[PDB]
Structure formats: C-alpha cells, structure tokens
Design an enzyme around this catalytic site. Structure first.
Site, mmCIF file in Angstrom:
data_model
loop_
_atom_site.group_PDB
_atom_site.id
_atom_site.type_symbol
_atom_site.label_atom_id
_atom_site.label_comp_id
_atom_site.label_asym_id
_atom_site.label_seq_id
_atom_site.Cartn_x
_atom_site.Cartn_y
_atom_site.Cartn_z
ATOM 1 N N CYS A 22 0.810 -1.224 0.000
ATOM 2 C CA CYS A 22 0.000 0.000 0.000
ATOM 3 C C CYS A 22 0.849 1.283 0.000
ATOM 4 C CB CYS A 22 -1.090 -0.064 1.066
ATOM 5 S SG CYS A 22 -2.115 1.415 0.988
ATOM 6 N N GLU A 52 -1.003 -9.239 3.532
ATOM 7 C CA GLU A 52 -1.008 -9.759 4.896
ATOM 8 C C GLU A 52 -2.309 -10.479 5.164
ATOM 9 O OE1 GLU A 52 -0.384 -5.256 5.663
ATOM 10 O OE2 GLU A 52 -0.805 -6.540 3.929
ATOM 11 N N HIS A 108 -3.133 -5.243 0.269
ATOM 12 C CA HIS A 108 -2.531 -5.805 1.467
ATOM 13 C C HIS A 108 -2.430 -7.327 1.329
ATOM 14 C CE1 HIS A 108 -2.089 -2.326 4.043
ATOM 15 N NE2 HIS A 108 -3.096 -1.803 3.327
#
Ligand SMILES: Nc1ccn([C@@H]2O[C@H](COP(=O)(O)OP(=O)(O)OP(=O)(O)O)[C@@H](O)[C@H]2O)c(=O)n1
Ligand SMILES: Nc1ccn([C@@H]2O[C@H](COP(=O)(O)OP(=O)(O)OP(=O)(O)O)[C@@H](O)[C@H]2O)c(=O)n1
Ligand SMILES: Nc1ccn([C@@H]2O[C@H](COP(=O)(O)OP(=O)(O)OP(=O)(O)O)[C@@H](O)[C@H]2O)c(=O)n1
Ligand SMILES: Nc1ccn([C@@H]2O[C@H](COP(=O)(O)OP(=O)(O)OP(=O)(O)O)[C@@H](O)[C@H]2O)c(=O)n1
Ligand SMILES: Nc1ccn([C@@H]2O[C@H](COP(=O)(O)OP(=O)(O)OP(=O)(O)O)[C@@H](O)[C@H]2O)c(=O)n1
EC number: 6.3.4.2
Lengths: 559, 559, 559
Positions: B404, B527, B525
């Site tokens: 990001c 993650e 993202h």
C-alpha cells in the site's frame, strides 16, 4: 474506642498481617494506646492442639494461651502484651454461645445466628478492646482488627455480618475499614478487574472501604489508582500500595510516605482523642527510633551467620519468633543477619550411609556459623543431631544458645561427654531404658509467664549481666520434661552452672558454662518476649558473641 | 450445528483468542467444517472508524468490511474466509433491532431487551453459523464463539443472557462452554480464589462450564486442579492450562496432549456428525502438517532479520497481520525470523538535529536487515523516512516489499531519484503544491476483494512466478490514493515495470524492478490473505530473498 | 441542581409512579422549581410506534413527541410541560451514541459502555434537568428521576452504573436515592426478606438508599420498620409506607404525615437553595389547595355517571388521561365521578344477533349516563357504535363531548341524520366508496401544540365561554384525517357551528350545536393539557353539564 478494621482481598494469602501491624505501629507514633484483635475464621479453639506443619509457631502469651502466630506480630511491633481473648475464632465464638445456651442464659429463645452470634462477636470485641495491654493500667484508644480470611466466605460470614452491624452500633467517625486487594499485572498491564468484582461482594455485605491497599508486582500506575478509585469509591489519595521491598520493617515507612496517618487522623478524628505532651513525645520517639534502626538496616553490610539447628527447616514458618528475634538482635547490633537453616536430621553420621551430600552440606553450614542455636520444636526424631551441634560448639569456642529442647540436648551432651556417662538420655526419647542418669523428668506443661530467680553465685555470669544483674526474670514456658534436679550438683561441679532456677529450687531454668566465650541455654522461650525496638536478652547475647563487642553490649546495658 | 463457546475470566486481557483459535484448529483436524464468531461488547459498528492506537489492525475481509483484529486470527489459523456478520458487537445488535423498530417490524409491542435482544442475538448466531466459509459451498458443522469481555459485565449482559437462553433453545449435547480463568501464583502458591468468585458470577447467569482453561505463571499443581474441580464442578481431566511457552503455534499441541479433543468429541457427540473418509484424511493432514511445521520451528536456528519500517512501532500490535504473515513465510522457509522494528520518524536526517542516537539506532537496524519492508499504516508523518528506506534497498541490493503506502513511497523514491524530478510527491502529503509529477491521485476507498490482472510482458517477473504464472490474482485493498496512470509509461521505460493492473488499465497494483534481486510492491494488502499452512506469496518471496533459495521456492511452486 | 432518584424493588409493577409524582408535588410545595425525568429500560425510541395494548396511552407533549404514559403523570401533578428529551430510553441512548459514532465524534476510540454510555446518560440528565418547564423561563431547582425497571436488571444495567458514577460526579448532599420495595405479608406476618435480598443487589451496584418506601398489604408494623432499618441501613423515620387507600391524590398527604419533606429538606439541604417570599407563598398555596380539593373528595357523595364510549375498555389503562381529566373536572365540581365503561362494539344492533346481553348491558350503561363522551382511540372497528352514542345524546338532551374521533363520528352522525345523506362516511373506514359526502379527508399527523382561533360569531357559544371568551386557544393534536372543509357551510346552516378553526380556515377544530344543552367536540385532545388543580375546559364543561351549575361555572370563570 476508635476502630480500624483491616479486611478483604480476592486470595486469602496476600498482605493483611504486614499492613495491620504497620498501621498499628504508625498509629502508636501518634501516642495512642493502640490495641489489636485477630479474627480467625478457622474452628480451632486455641493452638496447642494444632501442629507446626500448618500456620507455623505454637505461640505463647503471658496468659499461657497457645495462640495464632499472628498475635506474635502485633506484640513484637506494638510493644504490647495480648490476652488469650484477643484471638477470636469460629469455634471459640460458637463454643461460647453454645456454653451460654446449655447454661440457660438465652431465656428459652430460639438462638439464631442473627442477632445472637452477631451480638456475641460485637460484645467480645467491645470487652476485649478495653483490656489494658501496656506497661500502665490505662484502657486502649484505638483497636486494629485483622479480619482473617476474605470478605465473601462461608466461614467469615457471621464476622462480616457482625462487623456490618458494628459499623452502625459504633458509628462512622469511630470505625474505618481498610481493604487489602490484589492488582494482577499481566502482559505488563495492571488489570483492576479482580479488585472490582471483589468490591461488589464487599458492598453487598454492607461494609464500605475508606482505604484500598494493593498487593501488586509493581508500584501502582496513576492510571490504575484512578481506575480503582472511580469504581471502588475512595479518593485518589486513599489507594495505597504494599509492593515487594526486601525489608518488612520498611512497610510502616512506605505507608507514612503514602500519608496513611494523615488520612486515618482525619477519618477517625484522632486529634480529638485526649493525649498528653508525654504521649506525643513517646509518639515521635517511636517514629525516630524506627527510622534510625531502619537506617542501620540500610547502611549495615557486615554479615553474621547464625546456624539454627532443628527439624522441618524447609517450612521456615516453623521458627518465626526465633527468626524475628534474631533480626531484633541483629538490628540492635547494626549487623546484617544471615540464618543458616541446619537440618539436625543430616548432622547425624547415619545420614552419610543414605546421602553423603546432606551430611557434608549440613556440616558445611555449621562450620560456617559465627554462632549456633538449638531453638527446640517438638518430637524426638532429631535429638542425636542436636547433641552433635551442642558438642561442636563446646569443643570449638563457637557461641551457643539452647532454648527449651536446646537446654535438654546441651545437658545431655554435657552428661554424655564431660561427665562421661555414654548412656545418659532424654526420657521422652528413651523411657523404656529406665536409667540412673535420666537427664529429663516429667513435671501437662508449665505454660505462660513464670518468675525465674538467679542462683546467688552469679555476678560473674554473662547471661545475668545481659539481664542487667537483676535478682529475677519473668519469661514464657512450654516444657513437659525438665532437667533432673539430682544431676545438677554434679554438672555444676564440672562448671556447667545452672545460673537460673525456680524459687522452689527443684526446677532449673538457665545455664552458663565456665571458660567458654558464650554457651548458654534457657528452659523458657526467649523468642516470645522479644520486641523490635527492645530485643530479647539471650538472643542479643548470641548475635553479640557472634559479632564481637559482647563486653560493650554488657557495659551499655549496665549504664 | 454444534457450538463451543469460549468465555469467562476475572480480567478481560488473559487468554481467549489463543485458546478459541486453537480449539477451532484442533476441531478442524477432526475434518469438521469449523466456523467462528467474535462477540465484542464494544459499541463500534465496524473498525474503519477506529484508529490503530486501540485494538491494533483495521483488518479487512473479502466482504470489504473493516473488522475486529480477532477475526484475522480465526482466518489465518482455520484457513477460512469470514463475512462481516461473523463479528457481532453491542452497537451492531442495538442498531439492528432499532432499525427493525423504526421499520415497524415489532408490530407495535414495547421492545424489551428480554426477550427482544436475546432473540436477535440468538437469530444472528443461527443465521451466521450456517454461512459457507470454505473452498466449497457446504454449511459449517461446529461454531467456535469467542465471547469477548468477561462473564459478569454491564456490557456483556445481553450476550450472557442470550447465551443462557441459547443453551436451552439448542440443548446440552449441542452446546459446550469453556471458561478461561486466572490462577494467580503468590509467594509460590497457586491461589484459586479468583477462579472461585468468578464462577459464582458465572453460575448466577445460568451458564455452566464444561472445561476450565487456566492462565497461570506456572504449570498447574495437581492440588490446584483438584481445588478448582471440587469447587467449580468439572472432572480432573477437564481443567486445562495455557502456560507461557515461547510459541503460540504450540498451543494446539498443548491442548491435544491435555486431551481437549477427546473431551469435546465426547461432550458434543462429534462422532455422530456425518463426515467422509476424505474429510478424516484432510483432518489427519491438518494435524501432521501442523506437527511438521512446528518441528521446523523447533529445530530451525538460522536467523533472518526483516526490517519493518513505519510509525508507532512501540505499539507492536499495529502490524499484527504483517508480523504473523512474515512468520508464516519464515516457517515455510524453515528459518528463524527476527523483525527489526524500524522507526521511519528516526531514519530522517532531521532526527540527527534532535537526537543522534535515534538516527544511528534506526540506521544500525536497517543496515543489519537481510530484507526491508514498508507495510504502510495511516497518515503522512513518516513518508520521507520511508523514502530513505526505499532508496537504501534500491542502491544496495537489499530485498524489498512495499505494501500500500509502500508502493506509493517506492514510486515516489523512484521518481525523485531514478527519473530525477526532486519535487515529485504524495498528493495526500503535499496537495497545496499542485505539481505536474503528482505520484498520487484520489480514486471513499477501494475495499475488500478485487481482481488483479498481470500485464502480458511478465513471464520474466519473479513476483508473478511466486503467484504461479497465473493470469489473475484476487487480493484485499484499502487505498484512497493511487499511482498516477500518466506517469506509468515513463517509470516502465526506466525498468520499474508495473507487472499487475486493474482490468481497466487505469489503476496500477504491482511492480517489480529490473536487475535488482527482489524489489516489489503491492497496492493490495497481502497480509490479510496469509494462512499459517499456506503463506502469502509476496511475503514468502521477501523472506526467501532474505534467506536465499528464492529460485528453489519458485521451482517448487512451479511443480 | 439537586436530585431525588426514585428506584428499586423486587417486582417491576409495584409503586414508583405514584411515589415519584407525589415526591415532586410535595417538593413543589416548598416553592422549588421541580422538574422530572423518566428512565425507561425498554428499547422503543418514542411511543408513536407502540399500540395501546401495552403501557396504555400514546401521550403527547407540546413538542409533539408521542411519549411514555408516565410523563403525563408528572405534567398533571407538577403543573409543568415536559420536552420529549425528559423521557430517556434504552434505544434512545444507544441510538444517540451510535449516531455520534458514525458521525466520527469519538475521535477513533473503541467505544466502551463504561465510560461512554455512562457519560452519555450523565450528560443527558445534566442537559435535560436545566430545561425550563414552568410559566416562566427560569431553570429548575430539583430533578425527580423515576428509574423505571428494578435495580438488578440486564437492561437497567447501564442506567444503574451511570447513576453510580453520577452519585460521585454530583455528590452526596446534592443527590438522594429513594428505593421502593415489596414487604409481603404471609400468614398475617410482614416478611422482610425480599427487601433484604433486593438490598444486597442494590448495594452491590454501589447506590445507597436514603429512604425505603414500602408497598405492603397493611400498614407497616413497628417491628418490620426496625427489621428493615437494622439490615438495610436508614433511620426508623426513613422507612415510609404507601399502603392501599381508595384515593391516589391522598399519597402526597400520607408522605407529608410520614415527614418525607422534613427528611429531604435536611438530606438535600433545601433551605440553602435560593427562593423568594413569593415562591414560599406559592408553596403554601399548592399545599392548601391540595388539602382543600382532597377535603372536597372526602365529603362529596353526589354521584355523576359519565359514559365513556370506545374499544378495549377492559384495558382501562388505554384512556388514562381521559380518566384523570374527568376526575380533575369532578374534583373542581365537588362531585363524585363514576365512569361507565361503554363498549361501542356492543351498542351496535349486530351485537343483538350474537349476544343480546352485551347489547342491553351497553344501552343500560348509556341510558344511566348523566353525560356521554366519545374520547377516540385508534382504528375503525367501533365507528358505527360511536355514531349510535352521538345520535342518542343529540335526540335526548344528554351532554356530550367528542374528542378527535369523537368530532368525526359526531359530524358523521349529523350528516347521516340531520342533513340526511345516509351514505356519508369516514374515509378511513370506507375509502373504496369514493363519495361526494366524505366527512373525512387526509391532511403524517398534525401533532403537538397548535393555535386554535374562534370564528367571530361565537359570543353565544358555551365552549368559548368555558375558555374565558379569549380569541385563541393552544392545545395538542393527533389527527391524520379531518372534517371536509366543503361540508362545513352546510352543517353550520343547520346549527352545527364550527366554533373553532385553524387560522387558514381550511381545518375545523371545535363545534357546538345550537339549542342542545351542551353538545361539543374538539379535534385536539383536551385530556393531555389537564392539570389536577386547573382542569381542562371541555371536560370541566361536560361534568358541569352532567352535574348542573354550568352557568355558575361560566360565571365564576368570567370573573
Ligand atoms: N509485620 C509483619 C507481617 C508479616 N510478616 C511476614 O509475612 C508473613 C505473613 O504475611 P501477612 O502480612 O500476615 O499476610 P498473610 O499472613 O499472607 O495473609 P493475611 O492477609 O491474612 O495476613 C509471615 O510469615 C511473616 O514472616 C512479618 O515478618 N512481619
Ligand atoms: N466458599 C468458601 C470456601 C472457602 N472458605 C473458607 O476459605 C478459607 C481458606 O482460605 P483460602 O486459603 O484463602 O482459600 P482456599 O480455598 O485455600 O483457596 P486458595 O487455594 O486460593 O487458598 C477456609 O477457612 C474456609 O472456611 C469460605 O469461607 N467459603
Ligand atoms: N492464535 C493466536 C492468538 C493470540 N495471538 C496473540 O495474542 C494476542 C491476543 O491474545 P488473545 O489470546 O486473543 O487474548 P486477549 O486478546 O488478550 O484477550 P481475549 O481473551 O479477549 O482474547 C494478540 O496480540 C496476538 O498477537 C496470536 O498470535 N495467535
Ligand atoms: N461494571 C462493568 C465495568 C466495565 N465493563 C466493561 O468492561 C469492558 C472493558 O474490559 P476490561 O479491560 O477487562 O475492563 P477494564 O475496566 O479496562 O479493567 P482493567 O483495568 O482490569 O482492564 C468494557 O467493554 C466495559 O463495557 C462492564 O461490562 N461492566
Ligand atoms: N400519581 C399517580 C401515579 C399512579 N397512578 C396510577 O397508577 C398506575 C401506575 O402506577 P405507578 O405508581 O406508576 O407504579 P407502576 O407504573 O405500577 O410501576 P413503577 O414503579 O414503574 O411506576 C397508573 O395506571 C395510574 O392510573 C395515578 O393515577 N396517579
């Protein structure tokens, strides 16, 4: 009669004894005639029928009452003597009203725990707190009560109800409650919620805390002080902490720096309670004496190792008055005590057949000792081991003190080795042997205060010099067996002088051995009469012999 | 639909997330289609209106719902995707019935929290737990519920009542409750009383625990297991412990050795719930995969330091999915992660005017790093600092991943230094400057799942090789600002290839830089899509570049 | 701003409204500018979306807010007007902070019920209690709060916590709590134990009662006063009783004879709150007026039967402001009211096909009536029945008052029988018929206060004489349908004069019929503006017509 009731908590095993006693000492520095009560929710009537494996020492009052360990902490801090009625228990108070019932004194009413027990508990506290406890016959001013157990407990239930009524029958401005509480720290955060849930169960029972005292792994955050105070209503200056510090004698000084006297002086209107200028001068003396002796505890570094020889030394609670009395001696000497905990069950050579390590570890500790002490517990199982420590100290100049069982094993050692009758024995160990040299005879126990008189040929004796050369001494006993009076004249002809005796001459209570630097014993327990600011004379002697300057101690006492 | 409800405790901040997720993983090894619900007694509707200073990451679902951090733990352990309705909150359910009220749907009745909320809470749990969460469209078998807060709380009050009714409306043998509890240890003794008082307040609310899970500073004594079980009735084999161990991924293996599957298999009759041989084979696969990866965590010792560059790195909770995804990569690589926490606010030379130490400490950490990562939080205050880390990695061969804000500062660095326009900027930082080279334009946020398509000239690109050479990728977004589409053709002519784009070609989502070993970023993202047993491909790449063997990782993926 | 919070009890349905209102009236006799708040633990936002089958009347304020029935009791006793914010509810306060949340006003914090709701509840009470409620713009002195529900309830949980904090944020000597409680009598013995268990749950929540008010089947024994006071601590003179007596207007006089003013004057230091000699003179006036009107209630015996015609008259709660306003009229007339409850569903001849008894019983009651009243509830099902009562009163000289639906059915009767169009109808009943003579048109409801103006040719009209010959009147409305303005000029030519209108002339609000003794209706609800000591003029007229002396009432009003 003002009251401060210590109470509370989420775990029974947290911080009440250290706080209550410190509160009482602090209020004593106002010059108030402080007194103190223990409430034990356990059923036992009195301590003589419970063994040292639970709640430690079988402690003894001037009344001769075997009582809860926690009375000893109030005596040794407050400088007061307690009656056996200053320990209240569940089975004491239930046995009391049931005695009154079978006597017919309830006039045929159905005896109901409210109000009947809750009146007996209030009447007992109001009888007891007026009893004189000082050097003078005046009635007390403030009573500390330690409520044992936790508020919110099946067994402390009649006691919390009795206190709930008492808070109204003696009003606000004459009663104040301090609640001890846990403040856990988890992941480095001081989590208040156990001290919120435990205050629901507090306020449910109608009691209301005026102070919250915390036990925590840290000092309290200003955040957790506010988080307690906003939920469990007290001011920000009425939450206090009793964090881990290496000295229990500093807890009065923490609480004074947290302004706890300034709050209780206001909250119990203590400025209106009548005191003289002499009471206030004794008040500032008690404070400054406690500051100076703690300054000595702070700046002292010269170690003195005392080997304390006994059984169950892994339960270090079992010798609490011994340990505290040695520290009262060590603080008066300005010298840092270490106690070597020595297993008499290991000193015996039989140990070397089972584990050599235990033997050599015990003798390593005993060899290291600047002085030796056989303080005497209960039962026979370690007597040979204590005779070995009585021998080592005699043959090696090491200072010694034999309390109770310590006299008996020191005289048994002296009979075995210096008179040289190898069979001579403790009759409690070896009654079946029916000896001529029985160093022990039954005389069911001589308990509590008795007068001890010194034998006239004793102005040379260090132990009577430590007692100030006075003709008589008053101390507390526990013995069923005693020295055999027929053997005394033989031992004295060898220089083991029985410097102190009962007035009838048939019961022998102190010895001091000729030519040895300091080898003593007492049939009474000198631990129990020790005060923090005025230490017990046989123990001050033992640490003074182990330190040196025993002559200067005697000179200073003789002024 | 069986239920296991995790619950309880004397402190909110103890052990529920680690236990609930581990229970769900364990029950997944039976081959059951496990699902999971969070109950948050807080009022917030959803997480987009709460900042990372409290409860950490603003976590994102395929639905695009900004949701509680704790949903991420169920996704990454259970291997499932959750809908935004699997997070229940106080203000969600109160907003729900108040919406239904103003719509008139209560037929003019007085809406009372019993039964009305306690029906809405039960209806929501019964709607939600049937939603498919797997790779296949089948409805779930067992629902884990984490009751957040503690039982006995003003705000968890409608939820405990709703569960009390639910325990009867779906019976015993179809619902089981596990209570997490504190067992303090004080003076080395495991004091049960907080886990007795907290079970009075539990049973008062009509819930009944079938398991007690402890958090304690030790393993539980056999004495404290019996002391819990005799007061808070469960068998001796139904008290379990979650003691401190250096790995959270071992908590499933502790609970399996404490037989928690064997109890819940009996207590929820799970052998009668229908499963295939393939479900049972996937069940033993999930167990043996978890044992083998933890054996790698046990025998691995070759450190790999990742420098994670950002703000508020003292609140380490703020990057939780980053941290866990790096560990999922590190475990797959069989290599011991360390995360260097690097303050972008210190890398800036302005720091050296205020404190030199912070500057050199940050650059010491960055210099030490086997790979660098700019994961992107919120707000502009550290952007210059992140540009310095984007420069250092480009000019020094160090592996890099810009997520990001990491894309935006890596493209801003590339524009500032390799295109060489010194004014080029983030428009969110410098909108007033009205540049031609604005490296950021607003396109209020593209949120949740979107399709990413690779640009055709990309069979050379390592990042598309880590994604298995597939034409398209589906990942989760959060961005308000994006790369400026007019600047792209210039950057690509310099070798900063935008390897991935939106299907419209106006929005650029991945880059890989020519000739550098591994320098990447993602506008999504990565993650949030990481699983413990199947790690997120950009993060597996970063730790593989930092470890070496990136070619072998790509080869193994290409099989 | 002092507070008195009424609260408590073991059953929700016991005695709070009668006590709170009586407390407020009593404190008003000190000359204090008393105000009043209701706390309703139910979720409903406001009463317009709940039907009269639960909690009775859909009561209306000057604000036009459909609000809880219990606000009406404070208005009619205290002589005050309340804003729609003086009713606090669970869904009001949860909708309030959730509105503030989505607006972003919590600055990204996790919104937790403590402190966030418990601050909103305190802020709302502190906003609301300053709002002027009198004939003059001055802020209030004392706020009565009725805590609805019981202390110890899932839904009153945030309100008791909010009050717990408020008791500290505005201190003791500025807040006092009165707890209503049950004292059951069983086997003729007054068993206190429910009012002991309910005080554990009170004190647990940190609130502390300064008064205990009992509901009991008897006066309290001196024994049960002491048995409450010794357990639930208050003085013997702070337990009070609200026993069954045939008049609710005597409950202020009971509480004054139980010295409740003398306690709250001390406990809230009310002598220090500033008042003028005029305030104190109005204070003794309010007392002596209440004593004289209750002396009239005591010595009056001349019955006046009012037939109240409607639906659901078995739920007598459905017409509460009607019933109380008729009693305010009856007390002003010194005449003993009876209300005949008349089923409009029975007056219809169709009843005589199903059960003759219901028909003749209804017409027996209607025949017995000294006056008739169609007060208007909701829905169409009884309109034919009300037309029969509108006919009987017109053709038989019996006094009449048509409120809201009463105007519409009286004009429908007049159109059907005196104009003689047999099809003329309520459009809400018969919209599908598409008539020329629709006696009803929609104009979604005109609600709250509006100005009514009298038509100039009205100095002959008794209803305008009862309003004191003034040009304008201000009263509260509820109507969706109204009289058709085109039909008015025909009805007036027949002597059914529309004595009152909206200022635009298109909306017709009062009628009086020529030559009949007293036949009136109002489109506004005159019930809602009635005060106990100053009754509503259309209702004073109806009971005065039914009593005789209407001329003397008009003469006395005209002084
Ligand atoms: N003035 C004090 C108080 C306590 N202790 C030590 O602390 C222990 C007892 O702690 P205490 O403060 O009495 O708390 P607990 O006994 O653990 O529990 P309670 O709150 O019931 O007292 C004893 O072994 C004693 O050695 C002490 O040396 N001096
Ligand atoms: N519901 C209960 C349980 C126990 N007790 C009391 O608890 C006391 C023991 O206190 P403590 O040691 O604090 O409790 P334990 O049960 O031993 O728990 P822990 O393991 O935490 O010590 C006993 O006197 C017993 O009467 C009580 O009053 N009510
Ligand atoms: N499966 C899990 C569970 C927890 N954690 C870590 O533990 C913390 C949260 O602990 P948790 O077990 O969720 O308990 P708490 O959140 O403290 O409280 P609760 O009982 O409400 O979960 C998180 O920061 C997370 O990094 C983790 O890494 N993996
Ligand atoms: N009587 C109370 C007090 C607080 N809460 C709830 O407590 C939650 C916070 O949990 P926790 O952090 O465990 O409580 P704290 O008050 O922060 O206490 P601690 O300092 O122990 O965390 C909030 O959501 C709030 O609604 C509650 O339900 N009832
Ligand atoms: N000043 C009052 C108070 C009550 N009532 C009557 O009593 C009933 C309500 O009783 P109240 O005293 O309000 O107690 P409850 O409403 O039963 O319960 P709470 O304690 O919540 O008020 C109403 O129907 C009303 O007619 C009345 O006429 N005048």
């Amino acid at each position: 009669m003002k009251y401060v009731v210590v109470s509370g908590g989420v775990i029974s095993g947290i911080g009440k004894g250290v706080l209550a006693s410190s509160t009482g000492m602090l209020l004593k520095t106002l010059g108030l005639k402080v007194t103190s009560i223990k409430i034990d929710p356990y059923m036992n009537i009195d301590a003589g029928t419970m063994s040292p494996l639970e709640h430690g020492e079988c402690f003894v009052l001037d009344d001769g009452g075997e009582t809860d360990l926690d009375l000893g902490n109030y005596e040794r801090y407050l400088g007061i003597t307690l009656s056996r009625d200053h320990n209240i228990t569940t089975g004491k108070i239930y046995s009391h009203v049931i005695s009154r019932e079978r006597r017919g004194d309830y006039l045929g009413k159905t005896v109901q725990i409210v109000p009947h027990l809750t009146n007996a508990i209030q009447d007992w506290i109001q009888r007891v707190s007026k009893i004189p406890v000082d050097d003078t016959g005046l009635e007390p001013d403030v009573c500390i009560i330690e409520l044992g157990g936790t508020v919110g407990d099946i067994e402390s239930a009649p006691f919390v109800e009795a206190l709930r009524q008492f808070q109204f029958e003696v009003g606000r401005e004459n009663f104040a409650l301090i609640h001890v509480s846990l403040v856990p720290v988890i992941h480095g955060e001081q989590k208040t919620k156990p001290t919120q849930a435990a205050i629901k169960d507090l306020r449910s029972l109608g009691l209301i805390p005026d102070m919250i005292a915390c036990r925590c792994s840290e000092e309290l955050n200003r955040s957790t002080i506010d988080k307690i105070a906003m939920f469990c209503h007290v001011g920000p200056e009425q939450v206090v902490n009793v964090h881990d510090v290496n000295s229990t004698y500093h807890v009065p000084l923490l609480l004074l720096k947290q302004h706890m006297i300034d709050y209780l002086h206001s909250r119990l209107k203590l400025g209106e309670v009548p005191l003289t200028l002499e009471d206030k001068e004794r008040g500032s003396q008690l404070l400054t004496n406690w500051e100076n002796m703690t300054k000595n505890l702070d700046d002292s570094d010269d170690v003195v190792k005392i080997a304390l020889v006994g059984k169950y030394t892994n339960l270090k609670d079992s010798y609490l008055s011994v340990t505290k009395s040695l520290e009262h001696a060590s603080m008066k000497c300005r010298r840092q005590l270490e106690i070597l905990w020595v297993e008499a069950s290991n000193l015996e050579p039989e140990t070397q057949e089972v584990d050599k390590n235990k033997f050599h570890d015990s003798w390593n500790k005993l060899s290291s000792a600047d002085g030796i002490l056989v303080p005497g517990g209960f039962g026979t199982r370690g007597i040979e081991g204590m005779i070995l420590a009585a021998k080592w100290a005699r043959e090696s100049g090491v200072p010694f003190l034999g309390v109770c069982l310590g006299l008996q094993v020191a005289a048994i050692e002296f009979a075995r080795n210096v008179i040289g009758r190898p069979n001579s024995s403790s009759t409690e160990f070896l009654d079946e042997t029916l000896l001529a040299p029985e160093d022990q005879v039954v005389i069911t126990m001589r308990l509590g205060l008795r007068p001890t008189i010194f034998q006239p040929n004793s102005e040379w004796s260090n132990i009577r010099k430590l007692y100030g050369e006075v003709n008589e001494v008053h101390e507390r006993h526990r013995h069923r067996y005693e020295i055999n009076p027929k053997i005394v004249n033989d031992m004295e002809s060898r220089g083991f002088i029985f410097v102190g005796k009962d007035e009838t001459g048939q019961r022998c209570e102190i010895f001091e051995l000729k030519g040895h630097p300091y080898y003593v014993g007492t049939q009474y327990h000198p631990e129990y009469t020790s005060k923090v600011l005025e230490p017990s004379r046989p123990f001050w002697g033992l640490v003074a012999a182990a330190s040196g300057t025993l002559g200067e101690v005697i000179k200073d006492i003789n002024l």
